[PDB]
Amino acid sequence: IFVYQNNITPSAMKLVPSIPPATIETFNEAALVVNITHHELVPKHIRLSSDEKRELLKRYRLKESQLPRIQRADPVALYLGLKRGEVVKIIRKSETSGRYASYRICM
């Protein structure tokens, strides 16, 4: 993870995908001041293991498509460092049930 103050030159940015399996993350110091995850409206997102996901699709007779999606750029997806494919489980409170769990596949 890289916490840059103002900007990263496009020449430096070329080096981010350059070294796989290792994945490099770019974070602006100014954005991190407040933890968005902490906000009233932001519910709890939970990364699901390859198994946890497989089970979900199997248990709901789903194709990866049929699943509600989340952007790779989503503030919470960047926070949890979600890579494409990785499913997130979201637990929010409900006014109908007490709790409700939704799932969002990455893009």
Partner 1 sequence: GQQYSSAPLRTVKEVQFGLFSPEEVRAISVAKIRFPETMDETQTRAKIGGLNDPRLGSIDRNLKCQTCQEGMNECPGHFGHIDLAKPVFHVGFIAKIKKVCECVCMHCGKLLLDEHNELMRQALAIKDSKKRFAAIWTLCKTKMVCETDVPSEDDPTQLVSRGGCGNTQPTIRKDGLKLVGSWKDEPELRVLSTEEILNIFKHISVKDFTSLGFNEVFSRPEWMILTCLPVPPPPVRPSISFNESQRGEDDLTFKLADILKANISLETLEHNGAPHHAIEEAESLLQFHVATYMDNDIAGQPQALQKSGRPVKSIRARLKGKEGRIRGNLMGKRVDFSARTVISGDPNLELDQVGVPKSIAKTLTYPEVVTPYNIDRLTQLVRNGPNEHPGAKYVIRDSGDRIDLRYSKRAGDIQLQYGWKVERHIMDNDPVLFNRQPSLHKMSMMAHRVKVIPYSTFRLNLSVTSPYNADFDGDEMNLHVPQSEETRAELSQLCAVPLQIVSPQSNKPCMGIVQDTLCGIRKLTLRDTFIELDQVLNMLYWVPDWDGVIPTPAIIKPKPLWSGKQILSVAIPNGIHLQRFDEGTTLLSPKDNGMLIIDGQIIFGVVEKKTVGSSNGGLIHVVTREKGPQVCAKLFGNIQKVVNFWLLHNGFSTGIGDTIADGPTMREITETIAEAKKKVLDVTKEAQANLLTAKHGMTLRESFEDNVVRFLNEARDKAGRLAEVNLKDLNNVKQMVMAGSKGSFINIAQMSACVGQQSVEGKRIAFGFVDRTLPHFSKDDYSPESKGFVENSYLRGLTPQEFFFHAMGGREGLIDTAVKTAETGYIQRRLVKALEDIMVHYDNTTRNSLGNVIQFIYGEDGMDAAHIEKQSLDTIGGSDAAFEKRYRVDLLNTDHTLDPSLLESGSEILGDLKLQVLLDEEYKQLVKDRKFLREVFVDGEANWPLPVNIRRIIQNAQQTFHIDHTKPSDLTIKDIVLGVKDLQENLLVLRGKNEIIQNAQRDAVTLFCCLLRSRLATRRVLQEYRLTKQAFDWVLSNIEAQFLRSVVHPGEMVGVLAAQSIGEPATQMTLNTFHFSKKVTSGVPRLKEILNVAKNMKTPSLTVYLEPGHAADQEQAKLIRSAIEHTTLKSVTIASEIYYDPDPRSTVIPEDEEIIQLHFSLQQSPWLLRLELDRAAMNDKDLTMGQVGERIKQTFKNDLFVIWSEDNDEKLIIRCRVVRAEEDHMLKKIENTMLENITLRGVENIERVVMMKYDRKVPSPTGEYVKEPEWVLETDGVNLSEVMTVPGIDPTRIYTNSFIDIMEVLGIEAGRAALYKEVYNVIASDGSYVNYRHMALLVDVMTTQGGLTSVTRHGFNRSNTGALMRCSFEETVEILFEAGASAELDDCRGVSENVILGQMAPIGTGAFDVMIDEESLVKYM
Q: Kindly tell me which of 11 and 65 has the beta carbon lying closer to partner 1.
A: 65
Using CB under 8 A, list all residues that contact partner 1: 30-31, 33-34, 36, 38-43, 45, 55-56, 59-63, 65-71, 74-77, 90, 92-104, 107
> Judging by beta carbons within 10 Å of its beta carbon (0-12, 13-18, 19+), is residue 104 exposed, middle or buried?
buried
CB of 19 to partner 1, least distance (A): 17
CA 72 to chain centre: 6
CB of 8 to partner 1, least distance (A): 19
Q: Is 103 exposed, middle or buried (0-12, 13-18, 19+ CB in 10 A)?
A: buried
Q: Amino acid identity, residue 2? A: F
Q: Least distance to partner 1 from the beta carbon of 101, Å?
A: 6
Of the pair 12, 107, the CB lying nearest partner 1 is at 107
